[PDB]
Design a binder for this molecule. Structure first.
Ligand SMILES: Nc1ncnc2c1ncn2[C@@H]1O[C@H](COP(=O)(O)OP(=O)(O)O)[C@@H](O)[C@H]1O
Ligand SMILES: Nc1ncnc2c1ncn2[C@@H]1O[C@H](COP(=O)(O)OP(=O)(O)O)[C@@H](O)[C@H]1O
Ligand SMILES: Nc1ncnc2c1ncn2[C@@H]1O[C@H](COP(=O)(O)OP(=O)(O)O)[C@@H](O)[C@H]1O
Lengths: 442, 443, 418, 28, 436, 111
C-alpha cells in the first residue's frame, strides 16, 4: 500500500505489568506517557466507567499523535475509535452542540447477536409470477441437495435478488435468511442447449450434501449514532452516507436510549464503549467546552482523549488567556499526561525505524548526519529528507544513500530557520504586511 | 458489573417527613440548607398550582449544583417531565433561539390522556376488489370497493372498504393468510405477520408467526398515553398521520424546525382544556433545568422575562458559577452571576457552600464504594489531603487508575504506593501550569 | 435443602417502583416498619404487585401514537368502513373572502389577470417568442418547441409524476456527464463485475450489517391530520378541499393497482399498458418493521419484563431435563390466571381449574399451581415468598426422595429486607 | 398431523418458468 | 376554557375607572398609579373610538412599577373580538424573516375585519334511521326521523345524505347538527336516555343562525398570496410576503368598507422591552405609523440614557429622538408602604394563602427594604413551610425561615464580594482547592 | 485506472421472431420458448438464440425490423442505438435518428 506518517506504529509496546520496553512495537522512548496510555487502554478495555476526559500536552513533534495512534492500534478490532479535529465542529447545517453530540455518539458501539439460517443446494425449478405492470411479485423456488429437496416461497426482495445475479436450473446458490443475500457458488448441471446470449464461464462445483437448512449465530457491531440516523426519518440510511442528518430531535435520542437499555436487559445486545480523540482541541469555542463539561456526565459517554501543543494562550470566544487554551472548568475534570522532548539516540532510532519502513538503505555516516540535522532542526524535516535523498540516489543508479545525496537534498530543500533568514534580509522582494513590495530589479 | 459516570450515587435529597436533612442520606454529604430549600421547591412543584417560578443555584465549582438538580428530578419521579439543558443548546442554525427556548418551555409540561381506540383485527381470509365502470375517466380511481373478510377466535366479519383504507392496506403489503390490525381513528394499518394455522417452515422472508387474536373483530379498548404540549405542537405543525396526500408526502420530506405561531399554541391549549373538562386528561407540570446560564445572550434573557409571565409556564431551575461578570452580548453591564438585574428580581437564589476535609474524605468513601473498590485508611487520608490540596474532582477520578495499578499487581487493595504512582503518571491543572510557565517552547 | 435465588429489577419494574415511591410522599420508613410488623396495607399491596409482575399493576397493550383526531366512532351482510378522520382544530373562513378574492365572478378579474400573466405575456410562448424557443431547442435538444411552455406552466409535483424518458436528438449542446455514464451501466449489471461492485457500496453495507432484521426503536408520540378549514354554506369549498386532499393522480401515483384489476384493463377491455395511470412511486421502507408506527405486545418481552418469571424460565430447563414434578405457591388468583396463560404459551402439562387423585394417578403432569397433599413431589418453589412460618411449615409437610425448596428474591426491594 | 400450506393466489398474472431442460415465459 | 395555573398578573381584571375616567384607589386588582391609570384610560377611549390611527405611546419608569400591569389592564379592558398583539423586543430577530418583514406582520396582525354572515342549520335528536337497498344495490333509499322538544318530522334521504350518514355512524338517540349546503354533519353527543351526554335541542329544527367573524389583515394577506396556503398561519413559514398583494388587500378592504359588507376594527400592538430593537427597526416604525391601516402601538421600557443598539451613541430611553418626537409618554412612579401591602394582600388572595397580620407587616417591611417581586415570591414559598408543620395560617416563623433559605439580590452580591476567589471572574480565574 | 472486457452484439435487426413452445400452458397466449433474432453488420451476419426474458426488453425499447441495436452479453439489456441509414428515405417527413450501419463483426471482445 502507501506509507503514512505513523505507519510504523502498530501497538503500544507494553509488557504484562504495564511497563514499557525501551524500543518495541514501533515506539521508542517516552516511558511515562506510554505507561499512562496503557493505563487508559486498560481503563477502556474494562468498560465499567464512562465520561472520563484525558488531556495530552507537550511541545510540538513529541509524539502525541503517535501516542493516540498507538492507543488506537492496541485497542483492537470492533471497538470504535473516532478521530476528529477541532475545526470540523463548525458546520453550516449543524449546530456545534449537535455536531459534538453526534461525535460523542459515534464512539459507542452496540454488539447485536442475531440468529440466521443458511440454505445451500442446486436449483431445480424457479417459478416467478408477476403483474402486468411488474409491481407485485411472488413465486416458488425448488432447491435441492443430495439428501433432501423442499419447495420454498418467494417475496419481492428475494425475486429481486434472484433476477439480478441471474440464476438458472443447475446452479448452486447459498441463501442467508436474515441478511437477504444470494450468492451464486457455481454450476453443476452443464446444460447442453444453451442459448448463445451471454459469455458465461461459470465454475464447476460439486453437489452439496447433508442438511439443506443450517442455523448459525452471527454477531455484528453497529454504532449508536447509526441507530439515531436510521430511526430519525424515512430514508435515514441514505443520510448515513450523504451526511444530511440535520439536527436530530431529543425524543429520538431518549427512545433510542430506552430501547438500548431494553435490549441489554434481555441479552440481544451489549454496549461496547470506545475512544473519542480530539486533535487540536484548543481550536474550539467556549460554548463547545461548556457543552463538553456536561456531556461528560452522561451514562452513554466515551472516554475522551484530547491533544494540545499550546501554552498559556487566548481561549476562543473570550478575551482572556488560559493554560492550554482551555477554561479551568474543563481542566478541573481532566487528568493530564505530559510529554517531554527527545534525545539524540531517540532521534537516531526514530530515523532508523522510518528508514526501515520506507525501504531506504542508509549508510552509517548518512545516519549520523541525519541525526545531527535532526537535532539542530526538527525531527520531521530529517524524516522528510530521507525519501528525497533516496530519489537523488537512484539518479546515480546506486541503491545506497550516501552523504552526498543527503547534502544535495539539504541544499535543494530548505528548513524554517534558513527560510526566515533568507526572508528577513530581502524584505523588499516579498510582500509586506502593509502591502508594499518592490518588483523592479533596478 | 454496572456502569457509573460521575453520579448515580445520588438517590434523592434524603430529607425527613418534616423537611429536615440528615447528614448522610441519599448519597449527599453536607449542603443541608440547599437540600432543605430544594425540598421546599419539590413540595411547591408537587402542589401543581404555580406558574413561572424561577430559582437560581449559585455557588462555586464542584459544590454540587448539578447533583442537586438530579436529586430534584429523582425526588419528583418519572411521571413529572424533567428537561435537562445546557446554555449552549439554544443556538441553532435552523431556527432562532427564541423559538428553541419556547420549544423547551412547552416540552417541560406533561399530560396524561386515556384514549379510546376503535380496532378491527383478524386473519385475512378473502381479499376481493371490485372495478369501476370507466377507470380512465380522469376523476375517480381504478377500483370502487374492496371486500375484506376477517376472522378471529369465535368471530368472523366481512367489511366493505372505500379505496382510501385499501391504499394503506396495500402499502402494508398484506395478502391472504396474514394477521392484520386496522385502527379506525387515523386509518392506520399494522400487519402483524403470518397466521400459525398454516405451515411455518416454507418461507424465506424471516417472518414470525402469530396466532389468531382473541375476542371479536370490532373492539373498543382504553389506552393511557403520556404526551407533552410540544408533541401536540410538532404533530400539528408538520401533519403526518392522515391518509391524504399532504400527510403521506409529509413523511417523505426531510424534517426541519419551523417557527410555530402563537395561534397554533392557543388552539392546542383550547383543545387540551376541552379534554381536561371532559375528565379525560390531567395536567402534569414539570421542571426545566438550564445549566451554565451565563452562556445565554442578553436577547434570551429579555425573552425569558416575558416567557416567565405566561400562564402555562413550568418551574425553571438555573445554575451558574460566576461572580461579578459582564453579560454576554453587552459590553458594560456587570451583574451578579452573569445574570441581568431584570431577571434577578423574578428569582429566588439558593446558595451552595464549599466543603471541608472530612466531607471530602467521606465523599471519596461513597465514590469508592460505588465503583466497587476498597481502599486502605492511609490511602484514604492521602486522597483526602490531595483533594484539599488540588481539587475534589482530581481526587475523585484518580480512583480508577489506582484500582488498575492495584489490579495489575495481583492485589485487591489500594495502597499508598499506587496513589503515589497515580500522582507520578497523571498531573492536575496547577502542576501543568507550573510546567507551562517554566518552559522553552510552550511545553 | 433451602436455597434462595436473587433477581435484579428490570427497567419497567424500577420505573413503576420509583413512581410508587414518589407518589406516597416518601414515608418509606413507615412502609418498612409496617412491613416488619406483618391503610398502609393497600399502599404496600401496590409495591408487592409491582415486584410480582408489572402487568398486574398496569397491563401492557398496543403501543401506538396518540391520535389527534375527531372521527366517526360507534357509541355502542357486511359493514362499511369509510375514512372519516378530521382534525379537532377548526379554522373558520367567511364566505366573502373566498367569493371575492379566490373565485371568479362578474365584478373581479381573477381569470383575466391569470390569463394576462400566464399566457399572453409568457416568454416561452411560440406565437410571440419563437426565436427563444428555437434557441432553447438547439441548446437542449427537445423535439417539440412547446415543451418549455408546458414545463413552465405546470407544478413540480405534476411534472415529476408524468415525466417520461423521451428521446432527444444528438445534434444539441447537452451531452452526457461522466457520472451519468458510470451510473447507466450498472442498472441491470450483476455482481462480481468490477464496475458494478465499485458503484454498489450502499447495498453491500446494507447486507453486511444485517439491516433487514433490525428492530424499530422510535415512534412518534402524537400523529395528526392537517388542519380542517371550514366555510359555512359553500359546497365549492368542500369540493376544492376534497380535490386537494384526495387528488386521484397523486394518490394513485403513491400506490399500486390490484393485479386482477390490471388483467381486467389489459385483456377484457383492450387498454394498453402505456395508457395506465402510473403507479408504485412510494419509497420502500428499510424493514417490514419500519412500515408503521404500531408495535405489538410480544410473548418474549412478557418473560423478560418480570425478573422472577425470567428466573423461572431459566430454572425450569434443568428440572425438565432432570425429569421432576414442580409445584408453585401463590397468594392471589390474578397470578393464577397469569401462569395459566404463560403455561399455555409454553405448552406445559399443568392443572385446569380430585386434585390428589389426579396427582397420584397421572405422572404425565409437570407443574402444580396452588393458592394458600403430595408425596412424589421433589422440587418446590416459593414465588410469592412470605416468611410467616405457619404457612411455610404446612406448605412444607403438605408435600420419598430428596426435597429442594426454592425462593425467588428481588434485589433492592421490600423482600430483601424481608 | 401435518399442517396445510398457505394458499397460492395468482390469477391475471404472468409466469416465468425456469426448468432443467427448457425455459418458458407466459404473457397476456 | 383558557387553562392556567396562576399567572403573575392574574389579579388584574382591567383598569379601575369611573364613568368620568377617574381611578378608584382599589378596583379590579389595581392599586395606586392614578395618573398612569387615567392616561391609560384615555388611550383605551382612543382605541374604542376607532377614528384615529397610528399613534404611538410610551410607558417609561423604574423597574417593578407596574408597566406590564398597565398593559395587562388595557388588554383585559378591551375584552374579546378586538385584536391585541403582545411581542418582545428580541422576538423579531428571525433567521427566515427580515426585521422589517416581521415588524410588518406584527403590525398587520393587530387590525381586524368584522364580517357578519348567516347560515341555515339543522339541530335535533335522531329517532329512527332506515336505509333500504335494492336487489342490486345500485340505488339507496332512506328515511330519517328527527325531533326536538317542540316538533318531530320525517325526511326522505338521497344518495349523498345516505353516504354522509353511513360514514361517521349515526344511531338512534344521537343529537346531531346538519349543514345542508356543505354536507358536514357533526355529532353533538347523546341525549339523556338511559332506557357524551347533552340535552335535546328546543325550538325550531330549521334555524337561520348568524355568526360574526373577525379576521385579521395578516390572515387575508397569507391567503391572498398564492406562495403558501392557510397552513402557514399555523406552521409559521410565510416567508417574506410581497408588497403587491398587500396593496390588493388594502384596496379590497377599502371597497368592502365602502359597500357596507365589512367593518374595520383596529386594535393595540404592545411591544415589551422596546429598547432591544435596532435602529433600522426604529426607522421602519417611524414611517409605518402614518399608514391608514395602522394600530395604536404601546411601547414599554425602563432604561435611562443608554446606548441605542446598532449605533455608537447614547439616547434617552434607548430610543432615537425622531422616534420620541412622535410619541406621548406616560410615566410611572415608585410605590409606598400602603400600596405595597395592598399588592401583597391581593397576591395573597389570588394564591389562596391566609396570612397573619404580623406576617403581612414583615412582608411589607422586607418588600420596602428589598423588592416587591421578592416578597411576592416569598409569600407562596412560605405556605409550603407552613404546611410542613401542618397548619393553615402562615405565621412569622415561616416567613423568617423562607427569608433565611432563599436569598435576594443585595445579599447575594454581598456574599459574592468577599468570596470572589471561589467564583469565576471576568478573567476566568478561580481557586477550587481548599488550602493554599 | 480500471480495465474491463466487454462482449457485445450489435448490428441491424434482420428478423425478430418470438418462437412459441411445443406445449402451451392453459389460460395464456403466446408462451415464448425462445426468441430468434438475426443481426446484420458490415461484412457480417449472424442469427442468435436468446432467452425468453429479453422479449420484455424488446418491447420496452420499441425495437422493430430495420433498427440497429446493442446487446450486452451477460445482462442482456438491449438498447436502441438508432435507425439504419438505408431507411432514411422511407418517409417524406419523420422524427428519427438514422445512424450508419456498424462496422466490424457482430461479435467482438474489446478491452
Ligand atoms: N515514541 C515514538 N515512536 C514512534 N514515532 C514517534 C515517536 N515520537 C515521535 N514520533 C514521530 O514523530 C512525529 C511526531 O508528530 P505528532 O505526534 O504528529 O505531533 P506531536 O508530536 O506534536 O503530538 C510523528 O510523525 C511520529 O511518527
Ligand atoms: N454533597 C455531595 N455528596 C456527594 N457527592 C457530591 C456532593 N456534592 C458534589 N458531589 C460530587 O462532586 C461533583 C460536583 O459536580 P457538579 O455538581 O456537576 O459541579 P458543580 O458543583 O459545579 O455543579 C459531582 O461529581 C458530584 O458527584
Ligand atoms: N398598581 C398595581 N396594582 C396591582 N399590581 C401591581 C401594580 N403595580 C405592580 N403590580 C404587580 O407587581 C408585579 C411586578 O410588576 P411589573 O408590572 O412586572 O413591573 P414592570 O412594570 O417593571 O414590568 C406584577 O405582578 C404586578 O402585577
Amino acid at each position: 500500500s502507501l506509507i503514512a506518517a505513523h505507519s510504523h506504529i502498530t501497538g503500544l509496546g507494553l509488557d504484562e505489568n504495564l511497563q514499557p520496553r525501551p524500543t518495541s512495537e514501533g515506539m521508542v522512548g517516552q516511558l511515562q506517557a506510554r505507561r499512562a496510555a496503557g493505563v487508559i487502554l486498560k481503563m477502556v478495555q474494562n468498560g465499567t466507567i464512562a465520561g472520563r476526559a484525558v488531556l495530552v500536552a507537550g511541545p510540538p513533534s513529541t509524539g502525541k499523535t503517535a501516542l493516540a495512534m498507538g492507543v488506537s492500534q492496541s485497542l483492537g478490532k470492533d471497538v470504535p475509535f473516532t478521530a476528529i479535529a477541532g475545526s470540523e465542529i463548525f458546520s453550516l447545517e449543524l449546530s456545534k452542540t449537535e455536531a459534538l453530540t453526534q461525535a460523542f455518539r459515534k464512539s459507542i458501539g452496540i454488539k447485536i447477536k442475531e440468529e440466521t439460517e443458511l440454505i445451500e443446494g442446486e436449483v431445480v425449478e424457479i417459478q416467478i409470477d408477476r403483474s402486468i405492470t411488474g409491481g407485485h411479485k411472488q413465486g416458488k423456488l425448488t432447491i435441492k441437495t443430495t439428501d433432501m429437496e423442499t419447495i420454498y416461497e418467494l417475496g419481492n426482495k428475494m425475486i429481486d435478488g434472484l433476477t439480478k445475479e441471474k440464476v438458472l436450473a443447475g446452479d448452486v446458490i447459498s441463501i442467508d435468511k436474515a441478511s437477504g443475500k444470494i450468492t451464486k457458488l457455481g454450476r453443476s448441471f452443464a446444460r447442453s442447449r444453451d442459448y448463445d446470449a451471454m459469455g458465461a464461464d461459470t465454475r464447476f462445483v460439486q453437489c452439496p450434501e447433508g442438511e439443506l437448512q443450517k442455523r448459525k449465530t452471527v454477531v455484528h457491531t453497529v454504532s449508536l449514532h447509526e441507530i439515531d440516523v436510521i430511526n430519525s426519518r424515512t430514508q435515514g440510511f441514505l443520510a448515513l452516507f450523504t451526511g444530511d442528518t440535520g439536527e436530530i430531535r431529543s425524543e429520538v435520542r431518549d427512545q433510542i436510549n430506552t430501547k438500548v437499555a431494553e435490549w441489554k436487559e434481555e441479552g440481544k445486545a451489549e454496549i461496547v464503549p470506545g475512544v473519542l480523540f480530539i486533535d487540536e482541541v484548543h481550536m474550539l469555542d467556549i460554548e463547545c467546552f461548556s457543552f463538553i463539561n456536561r456531556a461528560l456526565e452522561d451514562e452513554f459517554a466515551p472516554i475522551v482523549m484530547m491533544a494540545t501543543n499550546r501554552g498559556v494562550s487566548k481561549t476562543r470566544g473570550t478575551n482572556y488567556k488560559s493554560p492550554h487554551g482551555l477554561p479551568l472548568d474543563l481542566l478541573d475534570r481532566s487528568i493530564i499526561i505530559t510529554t517531554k522532548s527527545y534525545n539524540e539516540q531517540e532521534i537516531k532510532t526514530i530515523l532508523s525505524i522510518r528508514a526501515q519502513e520506507e525501504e531506504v538503505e542508509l549508510s552509517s555516516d548518512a545516519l549520523d548526519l541525519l541525526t545531527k540535522t535532526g537535532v539542530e532542526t526538527s525531527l520531521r524535516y530529517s524524516s522528510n529528507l530521507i525519501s528525497v535523498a533516496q530519489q537523488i540516489a537512484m539518479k546515480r543508479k546506486n541503491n545506497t544513500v550516501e552523504v552526498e545525496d543527503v547534502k544535495r537534498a539539504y541544499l535543494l530543500f530548505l528548513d524554517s530557520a534558513r527560510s526566515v533568514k533568507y526572508v528577513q534580509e530581502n524584505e523588499s522582494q516579498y510582500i509586506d504586511d502593509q502591502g508594499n513590495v518592490q518588483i523592479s530589479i533596478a | 458489573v454496572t456502569r457509573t459516570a460521575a453520579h448515580t450515587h445520588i438517590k434523592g435529597l434524603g430529607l425527613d417527613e418534616s423537611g429536615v436533612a440528615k447528614r448522610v442520606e441519599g448519597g449527599f454529604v453536607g449542603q443541608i440548607e440547599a437540600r432543605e430549600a430544594c425540598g421546599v421547591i419539590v413540595d411547591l412543584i408537587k402542589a401543581k398550582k404555580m406558574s413561572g417560578r424561577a430559582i437560581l443555584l449559585a455557588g462555586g465549582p464542584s459544590t454540587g449544583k448539578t447533583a442537586l438538580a438530579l436529586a430534584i428530578s429523582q425526588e419528583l419521579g418519572p411521571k413529572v417531565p424533567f428537561c435537562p439543558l445546557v446554555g449552549s443548546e439554544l443556538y441553532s442554525v435552523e431556527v432562532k433561539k427564541t423559538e428553541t427556548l419556547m420549544e423547551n418551555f412547552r416540552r417541560a409540561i406533561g399530560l396524561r390522556i386515556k384514549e379510546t381506540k376503535e380496532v378491527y383485527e383478524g386473519e385475512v381470509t378473502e381479499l376481493t376488489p371490485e372495478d369501476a365502470e370507466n377507470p380512465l375517466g380522469g376523476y375517480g380511481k381504478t377500483i370502487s370497493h374492496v371486500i375484506v373478510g376477517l376472522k378471529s377466535a369465535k368471530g368472523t366479519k366481512t367489511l366493505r372498504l372505500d379505496p382510501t383504507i385499501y391504499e394503506s392496506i396495500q402499502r402494508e403489503k398484506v395478502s391472504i393468510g396474514d394477521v392484520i390490525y386496522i385502527e379506525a381513528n387515523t386509518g392506520a394499518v399494522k400487519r402483524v405477520g403470518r397466521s400459525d394455522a398454516y405451515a411455518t417452515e416454507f418461507d424465506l422472508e424471516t417472518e414470525e408467526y402469530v396466532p389468531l387474536p382473541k375476542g371479536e373483530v370490532h373492539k373498543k379498548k382504553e389506552i393511557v398515553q403520556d404526551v407533552t404540549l410540544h408533541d401536540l405542537d410538532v404533530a400539528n405543525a408538520r401533519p403526518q398521520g392522515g391518509q391524504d396526500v399532504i400527510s403521506m408526502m409529509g413523511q417523505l420530506l426531510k424534517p426541519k424546525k419551523t417557527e410555530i405561531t402563537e395561534k397554533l399554541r392557543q388552539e392546542v391549549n383550547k383543545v387540551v382544556a376541552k379534554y381536561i373538562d371532559q375528565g379525560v386528561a390531567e395536567l402534569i407540570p414539570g421542571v426545566l433545568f438550564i445549566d451554565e446560564v451565563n452562556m445565554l445572550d442578553i436577547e434570551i434573557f429579555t425573552y425569558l422575562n416575558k416567557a416567565l409571565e405566561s400562564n402555562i409556564a413550568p418551574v425553571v431551575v438555573l445554575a451558574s458559577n460566576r461572580g461579578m461578570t459582564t453579560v454576554r452580548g453587552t459590553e458594560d453591564v456587570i451583574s451578579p452571576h452573569g445574570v441581568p438585574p431584570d431577571l434577578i428580581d423574578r428569582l429566588l437564589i439558593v446558595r451552595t457552600l464549599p466543603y471541608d476535609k472530612d466531607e471530602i474524605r467521606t465523599i471519596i468513601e461513597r465514590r469508592a464504594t460505588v465503583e466497587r473498590l476498597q481502599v486502605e485508611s492511609s490511602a484514604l487520608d492521602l486522597l483526602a489531603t490531595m483533594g484539599t490540596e488540588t481539587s475534589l474532582r482530581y481526587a475523585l477520578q484518580l480512583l480508577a487508575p489506582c484500582g488498575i495499578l492495584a489490579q495489575t499487581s495481583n492485589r485487591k487493595e489500594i495502597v499508598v504506593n499506587d496513589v503515589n504512582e497515580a500522582k507520578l503518571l497523571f498531573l492536575d491543572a496547577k502542576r501543568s501550569t507550573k510546567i507551562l510557565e517554566t518552559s522553552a517552547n510552550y511545553l | 435443602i433451602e436455597i434462595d435465588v436473587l433477581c435484579d429489577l428490570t427497567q419497567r419494574q424500577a420505573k413503576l417502583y420509583q413512581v410508587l415511591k414518589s407518589q406516597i410522599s416518601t414515608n418509606y420508613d413507615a412502609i418498612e416498619n409496617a412491613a416488619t410488623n406483618d391503610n398502609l396495607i393497600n399502599a404496600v399491596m401496590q409495591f408487592r404487585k409491582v415486584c410480582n409482575h408489572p402487568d398486574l399493576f398496569e397491563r401492557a397493550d398496543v403501543d401506538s401514537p396518540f391520535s389527534f383526531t375527531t372521527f366517526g366512532k360507534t357509541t355502542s351482510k357486511f359493514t362499511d368502513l369509510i375514512y372519516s378522520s378530521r382534525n379537532p382544530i377548526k379554522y373558520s373562513l367567511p364566505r366573502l373572502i373566498y367569493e371575492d378574492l379566490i373565485l371568479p365572478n362578474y365584478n373581479n378579474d381573477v381569470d383575466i389577470a391569470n390569463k394576462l400573466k400566464n399566457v399572453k405575456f409568457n416568454i416561452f410562448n411560440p406565437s410571440t417568442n419563437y426565436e427563444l424557443c428555437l434557441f432553447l431547442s438547439k441548446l437542449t435538444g427537445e423535439p417539440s418547441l412547446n415543451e418549455f411552455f408546458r414545463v413552465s406552466t405546470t407544478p413540480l409535483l405534476k411534472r415529476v409524476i408524468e415525466r417520461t424518458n423521451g428521446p432527444k436528438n444528438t445534434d444539441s449542446l447537452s451531452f452526457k456527464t461522466i457520472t451519468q455514464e458510470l451510473l447507466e451501466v450498472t442498472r441491470n449489471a450483476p455482481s462480481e463485475g468490477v464496475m458494478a461492485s465499485l458503484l454498489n457500496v450502499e447495498k453491500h453495507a446494507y447486507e453486511r450489517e444485517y439491516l433487514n432484521c433490525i428492530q424499530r426503536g422510535y415512534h412518534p408520540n402524537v400523529s395528526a391530520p392537517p388542519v380542517t378549514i371550514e366555510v359555512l354554506g359553500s359546497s365549492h369549498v368542500t369540493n376544492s378541499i376534497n380535490n386537494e386532499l384526495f387528488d386521484p393522480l397523486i394518490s394513485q401515483a403513491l400506490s399500486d393497482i390490484p393485479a386482477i384489476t390490471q388483467y381486467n384493463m389489459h385483456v377484457k377491455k383492450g387498454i394498453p399498458v402505456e395508457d395506465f395511470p402510473k403507479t408504485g412511486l412510494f419509497p420502500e421502507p428499510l424493514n417490514k418493521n419500519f412500515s408503521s408506527n404500531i408495535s405489538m405486545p410480544s410473548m418474549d418481552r412478557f418473560i423478560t419484563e418480570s425478573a422472577k418469571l425470567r428466573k423461572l424460565d431459566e430454572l425450569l430447563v434443568k428440572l425438565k431435563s432432570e425429569g421432576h414434578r414442580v409445584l408453585i405457591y401463590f397468594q392471589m388468583t390474578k397470578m393464577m390466571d397469569l401462569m395459566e396463560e404463560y403455561l399455555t404459551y409454553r405448552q406445559y402439562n399443568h392443572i385446569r381449574l380430585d386434585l390428589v387423585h389426579d396427582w397420584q394417578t397421572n405422572p404425565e403432569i409437570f407443574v402444580f399451581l396452588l393458592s394458600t397433599n403430595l408425596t412424589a413431589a421433589d422440587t418446590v418453589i416459593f414465588y410469592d415468598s412470605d416468611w410467616n412460618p405457619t404457612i411455610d411449615s404446612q406448605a412444607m409437610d403438605r408435600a420419598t426422595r430428596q426435597v429442594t425448596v426454592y425462593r425467588l428474591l428481588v434485589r433492592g426491594t421490600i423482600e430483601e429486607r424481608m | 398431523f401435518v399442517k396445510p400450506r398457505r394458499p397460492y393466489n395468482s390469477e391475471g398474472m404472468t409466469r416465468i418458468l425456469r426448468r432443467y431442460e427448457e425455459d418458458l415465459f407466459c404473457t397476456f
